[PDB]
């Protein structure tokens, strides 16, 4: 199923549910608008439609921010959380869908107080919620009874996002029957970024020697090694795409290669190494 955190705040409105937080288990493929609208209509029928509001902020609510004229419902998508010790003991998919009581979501923040920033400022919080009972369960929701959180600073965000991209690209290249459209989406989204900042934004912010030093040497060294792996993964993905394409995508492929070569040229200049 699809799991959501739902938390109720409404001193003049809620009774048993006041100040409580639950994980709701929804049918597979349930989207955020579907559960949010159902919850909104359900409690609007109890309290009045002008009197119920959704809290979209995923940070822990401070009730001092809330207007006592309204009942509030905080809704946030979560996914089942497993530590690396759990992810190995659980062979089948029936085992990562069975006996689960921990759920994770991520919140963006920066240390200035702004919620978002560029790659040198953007931090991320990972919050794990633990329910009082295990799913699967007789009820559709289970109360959250504890939370834990960790936070990633900007270079840790870069290390996390770049490491995950390397694994994702390598996975696509080793799949027995590569889905060309899925490969191209991720490949083009790595070597030919035009809308978002591009992976070289991390290299400029954290690896360039003309920036003032800010992070431990060992973390800079780790990010450098991940970028070496990213360069390699992009090249391998480009070679797989070369075999898959038909004539209609020759010009597209050659443009991806040109962008890839330009990216390696810039990375080489930043790292003072001849990269591929």
């Amino acid at each position: 199923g699809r799991y959501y955190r739902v938390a109720f705040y409404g001193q003049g409105f809620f009774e048993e549910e006041e100040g409580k937080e639950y994980i709701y288990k929804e049918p597979k493929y349930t989207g955020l608008s579907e559960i949010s609208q159902r919850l909104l209509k359900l409690y609007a029928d109890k309290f009045g439609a002008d009197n119920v509001k959704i809290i979209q902020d995923s940070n822990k609510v401070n009730p001092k921010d809330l207007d006592p004229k309204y009942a509030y419902i905080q809704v946030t998508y979560v996914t089942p959380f497993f530590e690396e010790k759990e992810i190995e003991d659980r062979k089948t998919d029936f085992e990562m869908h069975h006996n689960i009581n921990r759920f994770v979501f991520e919140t963006p923040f920066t240390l200035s107080g702004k919620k978002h920033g560029g790659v040198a400022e953007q931090c991320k919080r990972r919050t794990v919620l633990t329910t009082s009972h295990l799913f699967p369960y007789v009820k559709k929701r289970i109360q959250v009874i504890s939370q834990s959180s960790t936070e990633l600073n900007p270079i840790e965000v870069a290390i996390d996002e770049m490491s995950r991209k390397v694994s994702e690209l390598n996975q696509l290249c080793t799949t027995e029957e590569v889905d060309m459209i899925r490969l191209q989406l991720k490949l083009q989204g790595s070597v030919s970024v035009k809308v978002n900042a591009g992976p070289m934004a991390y290299a400029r912010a954290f690896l360039e020697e003309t920036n003032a030093k800010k992070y431990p040497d060992n973390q800079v060294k780790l990010l450098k090694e991940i970028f070496r792996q990213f360069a390699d993964a992009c090249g391998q993905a480009l070679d797989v795409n070369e075999r898959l394409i038909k004539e209609d995508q020759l010009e597209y492929q050659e443009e991806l290669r040109s962008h890839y070569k330009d990216m390696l040229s810039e990375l080489s200049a930043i790292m003072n190494e001849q990269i591929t």
């Binding site: 955020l32 998508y77 889905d179 899925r182 809308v195 995508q249």
Partner: protein, 177 residues
Amino acid sequence: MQAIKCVVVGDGAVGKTCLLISYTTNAFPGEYIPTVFDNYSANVMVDGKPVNLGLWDTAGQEDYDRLRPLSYPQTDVFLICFSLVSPASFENVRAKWYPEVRHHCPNTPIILVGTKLDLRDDKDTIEKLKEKKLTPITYPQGLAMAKEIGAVKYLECSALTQRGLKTVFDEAIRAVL
């Protein structure tokens, strides 16, 4: 699982990336986790069929006009987006985006998407448009444009309220399936 390529075009600053991130991460737009990478994907269930929807996020500005059509081969469906509170982006549906898509892809279904639905009634937004003697795009006007360009659907959505968001991508898939 059937893989579907959907290419999203339209002027910059109509909210395209925000919508794509919000839909594919199942999160409200204010809570998005910035990514440095482009394009998005989702596993979707439409009329009992599971599909992987690949969403190409294209740069709309003129500097990218020359290379943007290289993303069009193998496309199954186009979303042409404009902001309901940007008359300029609406006019470019007719002056730029519809002609560009059809020059390259004569037979691919087009869905016309009006974004920022929540701002059409926003008092603040309404007043600032009045400063330049402008007014939001109404639903009849959007529908009239969809008729003009031969779009198979006309849909309005809001990333902020999530209204109409699920329907955009369900209908993108139904235009292919």
